[PDB]
From a paper:
Phosphohistidine (pHis) is a labile posttranslational modification with two isoforms, 1-pHis and 3-pHis, involved in many cellular processes across the kingdoms of life. Previously, we developed monoclonal antibodies (mAbs) against the 1-pHis and 3-pHis modifications using stable phosphotriazolylalanine mimetics as immunogens. Here, we report structures of Fab fragments derived from five rabbit pHis mAbs crystallized in complex with their cognate 1-pTza and 3-pTza peptides. These structures provide critical information about the molecular mechanism of phosphoepitope recognition, isomer specificity, sequence independence, and noncross-reactivity to other phosphoamino acids.
In the 1-pHis Fabs the peptidyl phosphate is oriented toward the CDRH2 loop, whereas it is anchored on CDRH3 in the 3-pHis antibodies thus creating a deeper pocket. The peptide overlay of three 3-pHis antibody:peptide complexes shows that the phosphate binding is more conserved, with very low RMSDs, whereas the peptide has high degrees of freedom in binding. The elbow angles of the 3-pHis Fabs are between 142° and 150°, as measured by the RBOW server. The peptide interactions with these antibodies are mediated predominantly by the light chain. In contrast, the phosphate-binding site in the 3-pHis Fabs features the presence of a Gly in the phosphate-binding pocket that loosely recapitulates P-loop or Walker A motifs (GXXXX). The Gly makes hydrogen-bond interactions through its main-chain amide groups and also aids the neighboring amino acids in obtaining an optimal conformation for binding with the phosphate group. In [name]-2:ACLYana-3-pTza, Tyr50 in CDRH2 and Ser99 in CDRH3 interact with the N1 and N3 nitrogens on the pTza moiety respectively, but imidazole ring lacks a nitrogen at these positions. [name]-2 also has two water molecules that mediate hydrogen bonding between Gly33 in CDRH1 and Lys94 and Ser99 in CDRH3 with the N3 nitrogen on pTza group, which has no equivalent nitrogen on imidazole. From these structural snapshots, [name]-2 appears to lack credible hydrogen bonding with the N1 nitrogens on the imidazole ring. However, van der Waals interactions and shape complementarity in the CDR region might be the guiding principles in distinguishing between the isoforms.
Author numbering:
A (entry chain L): 3 to 27, 27A, 27B, 28 to 95, 95A, 95B, 95C, 95D, ...
B (entry chain H): 2 to 82, 82A, 82B, 82C, 83 to 100, 100A, 101 to 112, 116 to 215
C (entry chain A): 3 to 7
Write the structure that this text describes.
C-alpha cells in the first residue's frame, strides 16, 4: 500500500509544496509510479509517470522524483490554479510464470489537499429569506452566502438573538483558480411552525477577528 | 481515443452494479484497463485491473464480489460488483492509469448511489429581502431541494448568463436527499433572470424566473 | 511489457 504525506498542506502563491509517498513494497521495474491532480467534479489529470516523466501539457514546475519505495512530488512557484488534491499511484507485479503464479495491483496514496494562500479578502454576505411557496410545504430553508473570501470563515446563525446549533449545512466551493478565493453557502432549515414563531434571522460570517452579519425580520419580506 | 462509462444512478442495497466501459478510437483489448472508484469526498481507490494479457487482478477487498471482463468484439470492459451497500456509493471510473506508459486515459466517471425510486428537485427562487440601498449589482439565486440521486445541472437564462454564477456543491441531508443553491450576480439594470434545473434521473427540467420581493 | 514480463 501507499502512505502519502502530508494529507493537507498549504503554500503562498510563488511558494513550493512537497508531497511524499511511501510504498510498503517496491514498485514494478522500479519505474511504475504516476502522480495525479484532481479538482472537484473532474476526472483525475495525470501529471507525471515513470517516476519523473512529465505528462503532455503539464507545466515544468511539477517535478517527480524518488526510487524504490519513496517518491516525491514538488510543485514550484505554486499558483492558485494548483489548488487541488494530488495522488500518487504505484503499480506492482510479481510472478508471471507457470510455477510462480502471478499477482498485480495498483495502489493509490490517500491524497494531499493543497491550499494556495493568495491575497486576503474579506467576504461579502448575502441572506435570502425563504420564498413564500416554501412555507406552505411545512419546511423552510434560509440561505446565507459568503462570497469571494480568503482565508477561511466560520458561520453562525442567530434567531432572535439565540445562536443555532441544529439544522445548518455549509457548502464551500473549490478555490478560485485565478485568485484563490472561496465562496460559501450556509443554510438554516426550520419547520414552518418554528419559522413563523420567530422574528429576527441572522447569519454571521467570521474571518479571524472580523465578523460580517446579514439579518432580516420575517415580517418585512 | 476516449472511453466512457455506462450510466450509474440509484441502486438498492444488496443489488448488483454493472458498468460498461466503451472505447472509441482504439482497441481496449490492446491495453490493461482498471476500474477505480471514489466515494463522495474521499480518495481514489483501485478495484481491479484487467491486464492486457487477459488476466483480471482484483484488490483484496473486491476479489470476492467483483468480476471484470473484456468484450473484444464490442470494444468494452465491464465491471460487475455484487452485494452493494452504502459504502459502495462512489464515482466509478474506467481507466488506463499509465504508471509508466505514455498512454493514459480516464473515462468521465459515473455516479453510483446506494440508498428506492429517484426524486425530482423542488426549486425555489432566492431573492433579497425588499430593502436595498441602491447598489451596482443584484444577486438572485435558486434553491434546488430534495432530489435523489445526484446530479442536477443548473444554468441561468438558458446558458446565456455565464459570468457571476456560483453553484455550490450539493449536500446530502439526514433524510438522504440532496440539496444545493445556485446564485447569480448581475448588474442592477438586469432584465429578469431565470434558473434552469435539469435532473436526468427523473427526466425533469424546471425553469424558475426570480421575481423581486414585495415592496 | 510495461506491466508484465
Amino acid at each position: 500500500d501507499m502512505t502519502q504525506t502530508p494529507s493537507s498542506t498549504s503554500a503562498a502563491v510563488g511558494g513550493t509544496v512537497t508531497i511524499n509517498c511511501q510504498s510498503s513494497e517496491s514498485i514494478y521495474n522500479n519505474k511504475n509510479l504516476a502522480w495525479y491532480q484532481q479538482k472537484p467534479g473532474q476526472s483525475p489529470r495525470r501529471l507525471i509517470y515513470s517516476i519523473s516523466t512529465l505528462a503532455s501539457g503539464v507545466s515544468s514546475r511539477f517535478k517527480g522524483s524518488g526510487s524504490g519505495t519513496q517518491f516525491t512530488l514538488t510543485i514550484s512557484d505554486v499558483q492558485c490554479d494548483d489548488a487541488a488534491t494530488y495522488y500518487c499511484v504505484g503499480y506492482y507485479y510479481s510472478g508471471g510464470y507457470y510455477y510462480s503464479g502471478s499477482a498485480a495491483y495498483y495502489a493509490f496514496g490517500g491524497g494531499t489537499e493543497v491550499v494556495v494562500k493568495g491575497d486576503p479578502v474579506a467576504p461579502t454576505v448575502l441572506i435570502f429569506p425563504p420564498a413564500a411557496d416554501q412555507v406552505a410545504t411545512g419546511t423552510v430553508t434560509i440561505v446565507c452566502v459568503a462570497n469571494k473570501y480568503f482565508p477561511d470563515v466560520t458561520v453562525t446563525w442567530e434567531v432572535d438573538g439565540t445562536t443555532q446549533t441544529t439544522g445548518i449545512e455549509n457548502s464551500k466551493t473549490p478555490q478560485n483558480s485565478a485568485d484563490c478565493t472561496y465562496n460559501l453557502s450556509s443554510t438554516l432549515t426550520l419547520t414552518s411552525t418554528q419559522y413563523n414563531s420567530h422574528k429576527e434571522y441572522t447569519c454571521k460570517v467570521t474571518q479571524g477577528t472580523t465578523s460580517v452579519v446579514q439579518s432580516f425580520n420575517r415580517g418585512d419580506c | 481515443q476516449s472511453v466512457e462509462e455506462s450510466e450509474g444512478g440509484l441502486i438498492k442495497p444488496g443489488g448488483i452494479l454493472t458498468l460498461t466501459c466503451t472505447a472509441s478510437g482504439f482497441s481496449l483489448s490492446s491495453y490493461g484497463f482498471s476500474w477505480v472508484r471514489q466515494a463522495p469526498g474521499k480518495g481514489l481507490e483501485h478495484i481491479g485491473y484487467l491486464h492486457a494479457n487477459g488476466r483480471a487482478y482484483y484488490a483484496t477487498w473486491a476479489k470476492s464480489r467483483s468480476t471484470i471482463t473484456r468484450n473484444t468484439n464490442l470494444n468494452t470492459v465491464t465491471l460487475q460488483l455484487t452485494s452493494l451497500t452504502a459504502a459502495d456509493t462512489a464515482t466509478y471510473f474506467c481507466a488506463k492509469i499509465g504508471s509508466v506508459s505514455d498512454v493514459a486515459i480516464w473515462g468521465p466517471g459515473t455516479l453510483v448511489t446506494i440508498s428506492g425510486q429517484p426524486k425530482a428537485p423542488s426549486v425555489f427562487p432566492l431573492a433579497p429581502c425588499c430593502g436595498d440601498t441602491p447598489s451596482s449589482t443584484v444577486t438572485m439565486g435558486c434553491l434546488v431541494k430534495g432530489y435523489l440521486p445526484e446530479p442536477v445541472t443548473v444554468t441561468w437564462n438558458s446558458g446565456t448568463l455565464t459570468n457571476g454564477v456560483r453553484t455550490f456543491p450539493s449536500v446530502r441531508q439526514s433524510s438522504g436527499l440532496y440539496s444545493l443553491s445556485s446564485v447569480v450576480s448581475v448588474t442592477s439594470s438586469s432584465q429578469p433572470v431565470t434558473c434552469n434545473v435539469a435532473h436526468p434521473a427523473t427526466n425533469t427540467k424546471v425553469d424558475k424566473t426570480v421575481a423581486p420581493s414585495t415592496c | 511489457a510495461g506491466x508484465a514480463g
